[PDB]
Amino acid sequence: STGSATTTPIDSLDDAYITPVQIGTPAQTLNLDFDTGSSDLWVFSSETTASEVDGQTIYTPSKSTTAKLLSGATWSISYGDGSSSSGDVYTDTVSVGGLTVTGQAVESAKKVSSSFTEDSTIDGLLGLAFSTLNTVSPTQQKTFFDNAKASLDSPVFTADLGYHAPGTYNFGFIDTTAYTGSITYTAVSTKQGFWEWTSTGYAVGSGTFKSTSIDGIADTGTTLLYLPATVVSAYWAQVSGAKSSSSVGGYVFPCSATLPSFTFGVGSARIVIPGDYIDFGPISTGSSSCFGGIQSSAGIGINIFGDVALKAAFVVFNGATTPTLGFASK
């Protein structure tokens, strides 16, 4: 089997991407944030505290003839941005772009934190990291990809995120029309549950490439590119007036600037992030200070190849017995 679904930016900055997902019988369609940095499929629901729902579409298990309470199971998750959610668990039929999994764990939110409530465009998350990170207790549950894998034509999914435009998530096949050149594959460590790999270095603008190993994760659920302070300082030093602002929470730059590109290495290959992809707009409405899309990871504990980096590439998440990642230009 295969599946193919369009993913659409939630706003004019590409802060995140939503993909429609069918849950239950008859189908209830929710727009989920596909997140290769986590492993829970959770949704706003008829069980979510009413004051914490503000415009989202909810899953109502009682209206699904295929929903079944997973007795005794609870979940609770905290994300790198400080947001969180928790609840109980149903199993139900879940379809993405024509690919159907029966018996998928659908984690129903009883509580969500303020940032989820405040984002009316995201109805939940669909985790695509390794199932060892799934938070369901006392019986850990599998991700949608893990459940679908055996049925797929090939045990892969691909992320093709757009810049200020829709893109595609494909399951079970590699669309050879969606990228240019060849796909370069690179090793993955699953030891932390992430799609964790080692970039071979970077360049700033037209500058020379610096060969240096940068371990990090391919994370579709993180907006920006978080890299070591040395790398980030070298980038922003090429932008007149750019500075790190403790009060804003990262590097800012004059909105009048033209930003240089940023290149990262994948083995001997190179992915170029155009300068425009690094502009996240005014820090507050009407400000002439703009927020940078490359930020330091020094306070995180891990480097994160988030959407800023991934949307410059066609990315293969290869879930073969030994997983690997592939990157191509597009």
Side-chain angles (χ1 to χ4, degrees), residues 1-62 64-67 69-109 112-141 143-148 150-190 192-242 244-303:
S1 59
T2 62
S4 182
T6 299
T7 194
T8 301
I10 64 165
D11 62 23
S12 65
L13 300 178
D14 297 348
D15 282 315
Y17 298 78
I18 48 170
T19 307
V21 178
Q22 282 73 48
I23 310 178
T25 309
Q28 301 179 38
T29 298
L30 276 65
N31 295 329
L32 305 188
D33 184 351
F34 282 25
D35 179 13
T36 62
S38 68
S39 307
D40 287 49
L41 192 176
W42 74 260
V43 297
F44 278 80
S45 76
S46 57
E47 302 180 329
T48 308
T49 297
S51 65
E52 296 178 353
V53 183
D54 185 5
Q56 295 81 10
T57 296
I58 65 168
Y59 170 58
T60 303
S62 65
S64 173
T65 59
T66 42
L69 178 74
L70 187 62
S71 187
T74 61
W75 62 280
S76 178
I77 193 162
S78 306
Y79 297 101
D81 66 354
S83 66
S84 64
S85 53
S86 62
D88 57 14
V89 186
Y90 294 81
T91 59
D92 210 340
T93 301
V94 172
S95 300
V96 175
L99 171 66
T100 299
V101 168
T102 59
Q104 173 66 45
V106 176
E107 301 172 35
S108 169
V112 305
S113 66
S114 58
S115 64
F116 287 116
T117 299
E118 288 160 4
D119 184 1
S120 68
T121 72
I122 290 174
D123 302 325
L125 268 67
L126 189 151
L128 294 166
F130 293 88
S131 293
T132 53
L133 293 180
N134 177 265
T135 78
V136 176
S137 180
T139 305
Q140 188 171 62
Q141 301 294 303
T143 70
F144 175 82
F145 179 53
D146 212 335
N147 280 324
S151 301
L152 296 178
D153 291 357
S154 184
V156 304
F157 68 91
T158 64
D160 179 11
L161 302 181
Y163 168 68
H164 295 173
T168 305
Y169 282 102
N170 289 330
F171 291 83
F173 72 104
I174 285 162
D175 178 356
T176 62
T177 74
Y179 59 88
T180 64
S182 58
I183 306 178
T184 298
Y185 288 88
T186 197
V188 165
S189 171
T190 66
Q192 296 192 88
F194 299 122
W195 294 91
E196 188 171 1
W197 65 289
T198 302
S199 172
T200 49
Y202 68 98
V204 175
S206 58
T208 61
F209 186 85
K210 173 74 169 180
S211 292
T212 184
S213 295
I214 304 170
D215 180 287
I217 66 170
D219 185 1
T220 60
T222 289
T223 312
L224 305 185
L225 174 53
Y226 294 87
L227 293 172
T230 50
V231 178
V232 176
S233 183
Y235 178 81
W236 290 110
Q238 297 304 310
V239 179
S240 290
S244 183
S245 170
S246 57
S247 62
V248 176
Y251 280 89
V252 297
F253 67 94
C255 291
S256 58
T258 300
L259 297 176
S261 63
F262 184 89
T263 300
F264 63 95
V266 183
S268 58
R270 307 286 180 255
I271 300 296
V272 181
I273 304 172
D276 286 354
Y277 292 25
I278 300 160
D279 183 356
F280 279 75
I283 60 170
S284 298
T285 305
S287 179
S288 71
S289 293
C290 274
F291 198 66
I294 296 178
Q295 299 291 345
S296 178
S297 64
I300 297 177
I302 197 159
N303 300 306

